[model samples]
Target: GSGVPINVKCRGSRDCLDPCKKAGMRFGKCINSKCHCTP
Candidate 1:
């Protein structure tokens, strides 16, 4: 049997935008306060 791995999500302002958003992709923010990556 395989061990269960912990899943984590980033955090930030939901008002933020996604990287691909500039290209017409859906934009969103992370859940982790320190996350700056594209939503």
Candidate 2:
């Protein structure tokens, strides 16, 4: 598959926006943010 798919601006599953929810750093579900698979 191709690459280029990022937007991990999340935060505890609420579309982060407030300094990552007090530095909680959530939104951990936006991988494949440009891997360019190849092996």
Candidate 3:
């Protein structure tokens, strides 16, 4: 499987969903100031 790693500033969990959708993946979590998507 491929990994979808993205970097973005988020105020809350919902903010991460947009990028996840764009990357064609599920929203995981924000860690180390970055947004992570499920593989």
For all candidates in order, the CA lDDT equals 0.37, 0.33, 0.70
Model 3 lDDT vs. the true structure?
0.70
Better lDDT candidate (1, 2): 1
Q: Work out the TM-score per prediction.
A: 0.24, 0.17, 0.60
Tens digit per residue, CA lDDT, model 2, 1-39:
432223444333334333343445432232333212111
For candidate 3, what is the TM-score? Answer: 0.60
Q: Once model 1 is optimally superposed onto the true structure by TM-score, how far is the C-alpha of residue 7 displaced, in angstroms?
A: 16
How many backbone clashes does every candidate have?
A: 4, 1, 0
Candidate 1 local lDDT, residue 38: 42
Better structure of 2 and 3 per TM-score: 3
Off by over 4 Å in 1: 1-11, 18-20, 34-39
- Candidate 1 lDDT (Cα, whole model)? 0.37
Span of ten consecutive residues with least summed lDDT in model 1:
1-10
